Amino acid sequence: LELGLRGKKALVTGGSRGVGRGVVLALARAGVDVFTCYREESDASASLARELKQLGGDHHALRADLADPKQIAELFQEVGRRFGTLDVVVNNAGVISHVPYAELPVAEWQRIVDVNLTGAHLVIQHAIPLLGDKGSVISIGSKSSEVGIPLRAHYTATKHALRGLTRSLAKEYGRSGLRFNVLALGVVETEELHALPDDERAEMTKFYSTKTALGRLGTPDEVAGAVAWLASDLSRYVTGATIHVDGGIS
Amino acid sequence: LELGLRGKKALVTGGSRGVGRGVVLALARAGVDVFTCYREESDASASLARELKQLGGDHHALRADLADPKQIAELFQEVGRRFGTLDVVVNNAGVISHVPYAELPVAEWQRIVDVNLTGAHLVIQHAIPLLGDKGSVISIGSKSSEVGIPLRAHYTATKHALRGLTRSLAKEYGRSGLRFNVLALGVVETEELHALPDDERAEMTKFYSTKTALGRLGTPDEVAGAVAWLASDLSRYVTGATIHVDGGIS
Amino acid sequence: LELGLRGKKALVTGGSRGVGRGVVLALARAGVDVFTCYREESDASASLARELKQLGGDHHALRADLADPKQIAELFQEVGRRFGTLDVVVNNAGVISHVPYAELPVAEWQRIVDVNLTGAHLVIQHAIPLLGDKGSVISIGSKSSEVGIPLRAHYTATKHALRGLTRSLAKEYGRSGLRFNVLALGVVETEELHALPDDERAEMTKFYSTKTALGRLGTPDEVAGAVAWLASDLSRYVTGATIHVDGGIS
Amino acid sequence: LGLRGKKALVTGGSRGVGRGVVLALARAGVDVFTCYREESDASASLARELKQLGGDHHALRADLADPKQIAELFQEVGRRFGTLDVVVNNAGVISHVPYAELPVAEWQRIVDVNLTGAHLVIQHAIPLLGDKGSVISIGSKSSEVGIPLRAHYTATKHALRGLTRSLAKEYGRSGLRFNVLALGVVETEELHALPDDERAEMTKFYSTKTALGRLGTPDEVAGAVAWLASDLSRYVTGATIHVDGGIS
Numbered sequence A, B, C: 001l002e003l004g005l006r007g008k009k010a011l012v013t014g015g016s017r018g019v020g021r022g023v024v025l026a027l028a029r030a031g032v033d034v035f036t037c038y039r040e041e042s043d044a045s046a047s048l049a050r051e052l053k054q055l056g057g058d059h060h061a062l063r064a065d066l067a068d069p070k071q072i073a074e075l076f077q078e079v080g081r082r083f084g085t086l087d088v089v090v091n092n093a094g095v096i097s098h099v100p101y102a103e104l105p106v107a108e109w110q111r112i113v114d115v116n117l118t119g120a121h122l123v124i125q126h127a128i129p130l131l132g133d134k135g136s137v138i139s140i141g142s143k144s145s146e147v148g149i150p151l152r153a154h155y156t157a158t159k160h161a162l163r164g165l166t167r168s169l170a171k172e173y174g175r176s177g178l179r180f181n182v183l184a185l186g187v188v189e190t191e192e193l194h195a196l197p198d199d200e201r202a203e204m205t206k207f208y209s210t211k212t213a214l215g216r217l218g219t220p221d222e223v224a225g226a227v228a229w230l231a232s233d234l235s236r237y238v239t240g241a242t243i244h245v246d247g248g249i250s
Numbered sequence D: 001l002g003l004r005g006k007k008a009l010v011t012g013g014s015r016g017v018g019r020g021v022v023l024a025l026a027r028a029g030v031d032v033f034t035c036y037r038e039e040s041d042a043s044a045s046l047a048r049e050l051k052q053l054g055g056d057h058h059a060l061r062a063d064l065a066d067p068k069q070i071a072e073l074f075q076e077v078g079r080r081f082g083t084l085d086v087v088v089n090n091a092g093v094i095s096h097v098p099y100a101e102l103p104v105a106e107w108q109r110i111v112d113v114n115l116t117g118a119h120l121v122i123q124h125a126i127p128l129l130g131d132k133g134s135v136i137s138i139g140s141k142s143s144e145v146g147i148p149l150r151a152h153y154t155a156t157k158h159a160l161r162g163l164t165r166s167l168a169k170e171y172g173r174s175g176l177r178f179n180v181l182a183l184g185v186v187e188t189e190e191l192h193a194l195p196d197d198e199r200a201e202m203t204k205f206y207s208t209k210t211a212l213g214r215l216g217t218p219d220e221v222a223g224a225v226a227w228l229a230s231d232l233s234r235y236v237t238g239a240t241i242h243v244d245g246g247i248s
């Protein structure tokens, strides 16, 4: 009963902020070699590279717009050279916006589809040759895609699509040693929430807290505990599953 | 009471063959004015066109590739012209292919997403103004997106995305009197199966029958029974739901 | 096309109040012969009886405590003697209470299990011979058994148990012509909602109304629209399903 | 994972899934209390490996169909452990009976053990879990699928999810988490005691339905129990975790 992660190689999309950042740092502290990407150079990406260097291990953070297939194929050329193999993939990169559905432009629909759904598919497709004969693929889904949220049907559409992708991939590749699962998250504190001043903050927090069974929002490190279990052989009979990490929300 | 469908106006995408043909014809015979579409001109679209005008009522069948956003806008100006209003929309048009996932070309991924997911989204977005203050939107999903099927991860991804779209649209427009639901179909005999030689047809017929509770495959008219119910005021408190019409299949 | 319920024979448990009363009256006014039961005589049982005898058809309302298996057997001696056959069964009788779980007496747990689960099972088992070779069994479930409600875990346990019973019965009897489904209800207006002082008619109606997509509570007649569909041949390919009639709640 | 030193109760630990979970938790340094219905080779040999491992483990008889014996079981758990960190509702029974021929007493036995027994175990365990604790009930993927001749079994296994969801809502702010592990098909002694012929056929039959091409083992179940027992899952409650090899 040991996670046994030290020495594994992971790819985590969207590691500069939020959930992806916490997963990257927690996997790295546990001795996983982490490859991550981000869309745009920023102080968050720069501080990310700084912590990865501060820690021991063979970590890499490259810019790659998942809306762009050329940049995804380039990311994986770098992954194939620096790592050569993979044990874990975490599809975490995603975008959201609130547009009244009737006003949602076709281009904003297309962007959210390109990043959240087509981006995840291309990442997985490029990762399959690197995963070899054994590997664990983890996609970050959303509890909200079962509940429904006004002004985000495009987001809930893409997040729910990940579950159907995952279920079929679990069937197609299970006998080859690849496992595919979804983590359905509740509401997780991120820097964008702590960048809000107290009023439009301690009002979101209690609005969502009452919705939960635990009475609090999640953190990126709690998500990482579940990623760690799915990365490990303690979950070797788990595939095609949607694991809720949501505090029992609604 | 009664279905009370007579005189309503419905739009059914992909009405020339298979499930959609069954739904169009059954709704027409019940006195619903049906507007349908199809991708290319064919013997099926021609024969469908003849049958609808020989039936009573004001029906229309137009060519429109849902992979093309401009043809959807065109289709809907023709709908707003000829009908002026809608009571029912049925997103039935869909495509499928069986490709090893590692070999799935990006353009084919994009084709199945363009038709099954983005096309459905554009049809609903264009329909909302025409549905007004009461309306019923029905999207055709699939039991298989919960089960997983090898070589169709792109198909089960798009079909599962329809449920996530539907749930949020139901929350968003529910107080406007608009309802959104998904019909998750099992296996339905279509022309494409009675056109295979005797028993590769009977072999898959038995293969799929053994998985059902009922011991048989579904028919397009059985789907029509569920569309009829969702179009009707007998389902006026039903929204955001996935209704299985699948014979109890696994 | 049409529902075709005229002439069918139905059994509806718990028909004197609320959802059950609404289903009994709607089926009776549709020309179905309705046999119903209730636990004690009240203003409600008497008005139901009077209200039935004023409608065409052969209807019966008898008392039977579903917690007592001997009274269930007795009930079905009466159904066999007055009806001889059944086309439709609706397991609607159910009880609920709000008790802190640590304080829940063993006997109160036993009560709601005996009525909501063991009672429904015995009703179905007695009904199977009377349903013959064609028949539709409909059990009343609850959306809340997916959500969770404090002080009602015994209730949600039994309501969720009905889905598991139904799924297996659909597999076991589908090839014999019997269909089994659950209707999962949201919050429905009943007499018990109308008997509170407006001290909470309503805070409660706003509290539950805001959780729905439609912005209102359900009514018993809206439930009857779904019962009507499931009793009908329009749903002949629907079995083993959980049908949500909940206004898109949570 | 940080499991060493915790105290756990696992019902039905003498055979099958429960035995694997008991032994795996014990070998991780968890003090394990378990129970079983009949004294047998399995319970005696179980007691011999638990004393060979060291640690403070206990195996008592308690028929979970009898509320009195559940009370007595929790008297002894309260006295030897004083508190609990983990509860695993694992004890369960099944039978394959044509539904029309199912005797009321057999319906009642399946309900008493699989649903009411689990409820009583949880209700008695809540005082002992105190301010922090993790409750895990063993459910079944088959209760979503439906299986002929066992509707009574799938009824009770599905009931556990409705119970769990409400208990998670009720007790989450008190520090208690409630989750369900829905199992697929798991290899037990029960299957390896069948002749090569019928066993080979059953193995192929269920394997074809899984994504992984094999049946599960009790140790694979224990890996999920271990995660739900640990603070790595401290934001997981009210969830149904499938440990089923992707079975249909």
Ligand SMILES: NC(=O)C1=CN([C@@H]2O[C@H](COP(=O)(O)OP(=O)(O)OC[C@H]3O[C@@H](n4cnc5c(N)ncnc54)[C@H](OP(=O)(O)O)[C@@H]3O)[C@@H](O)[C@H]2O)C=CC1
Pocket: A013, A014, A015, A016, A017, A018, A019, A020, A037, A038, A039, A040, A041, A042, A044, A064, A065, A066, A067, A091, A092, A093, A094, A095, A115, A140, A141, A142, A143, A144, A159, A185, A186, A187, A188, A189, A190, A191, A192
């Ligand atoms: N409560 C929550 O936060 C919930 C989150 N989720 C999901 O978790 C995941 C991460 O959530 P969260 O941390 O809150 O999101 P954030 O907005 O905080 O960060 C998202 C990360 O994804 C990267 N990203 C966005 N677009 C791209 C792109 N085209 N290419 C490469 N990287 C990109 C970002 O990089 P960059 O800095 O360059 O912009 C960023 O690092 C998402 O998939 C989300 O849907 C699920 C339900 C609830």
Ligand SMILES: NC(=O)C1=CN([C@@H]2O[C@H](COP(=O)(O)OP(=O)(O)OC[C@H]3O[C@@H](n4cnc5c(N)ncnc54)[C@H](OP(=O)(O)O)[C@@H]3O)[C@@H](O)[C@H]2O)C=CC1
Pocket: B013, B014, B015, B016, B017, B018, B019, B020, B037, B038, B039, B040, B041, B042, B044, B064, B065, B066, B067, B091, B092, B093, B094, B095, B115, B140, B141, B142, B143, B144, B159, B184, B185, B186, B187, B188, B189, B190, B192
């Ligand atoms: N067993 C089954 O039948 C299953 C079906 N479904 C779903 O049912 C729906 C219809 O299924 P089915 O009848 O089997 O499919 P069919 O192959 O029989 O074709 C259905 C219709 O969709 C039209 N279509 C395809 N692409 C387009 C497009 N770009 N624009 C407009 N119309 C298009 C087709 O037009 P054209 O004739 O011009 O090619 C045709 O009229 C699909 O959405 C499917 O996912 C769900 C589960 C199982």
Ligand SMILES: NC(=O)C1=CN([C@@H]2O[C@H](COP(=O)(O)OP(=O)(O)OC[C@H]3O[C@@H](n4cnc5c(N)ncnc54)[C@H](OP(=O)(O)O)[C@@H]3O)[C@@H](O)[C@H]2O)C=CC1
Pocket: C013, C014, C015, C016, C017, C018, C019, C020, C037, C038, C039, C040, C041, C042, C044, C064, C065, C066, C067, C091, C092, C093, C094, C095, C115, C140, C141, C142, C143, C144, C185, C186, C187, C188, C189, C190, C191, C192
């Ligand atoms: N209304 C809602 O918001 C919800 C409804 N449901 C379910 O719908 C069904 C309808 O319940 P509802 O109308 O709301 O509640 P009510 O209390 O208003 O009516 C319940 C009926 O059950 C009758 N009955 C017959 N035998 C028994 C027996 N042994 N024990 C108890 N009742 C018996 C009762 O008769 P008597 O008059 O003698 O008491 C009564 O008529 C229930 O099963 C409920 O769980 C599910 C979720 C939400």
Ligand SMILES: NC(=O)C1=CN([C@@H]2O[C@H](COP(=O)(O)OP(=O)(O)OC[C@H]3O[C@@H](n4cnc5c(N)ncnc54)[C@H](OP(=O)(O)O)[C@@H]3O)[C@@H](O)[C@H]2O)C=CC1
Pocket: D011, D012, D013, D014, D015, D016, D017, D018, D035, D036, D037, D038, D039, D040, D042, D062, D063, D064, D065, D089, D090, D091, D092, D093, D113, D138, D139, D140, D141, D157, D182, D183, D184, D185, D186, D187, D188, D190
């Ligand atoms: N493929 C599988 O094995 C699956 C198993 N499950 C669930 O896993 C759990 C155990 O399954 P499995 O290992 O296969 O079954 P087993 O028969 O192998 O073991 C059952 C264990 O529970 C004990 N037990 C049964 N009834 C009682 C009772 N009244 N009181 C105390 N102990 C009792 C038994 O004790 P005793 O030795 O005295 O009989 C035994 O130790 C069950 O909950 C089952 O529903 C779920 C899905 C699939």
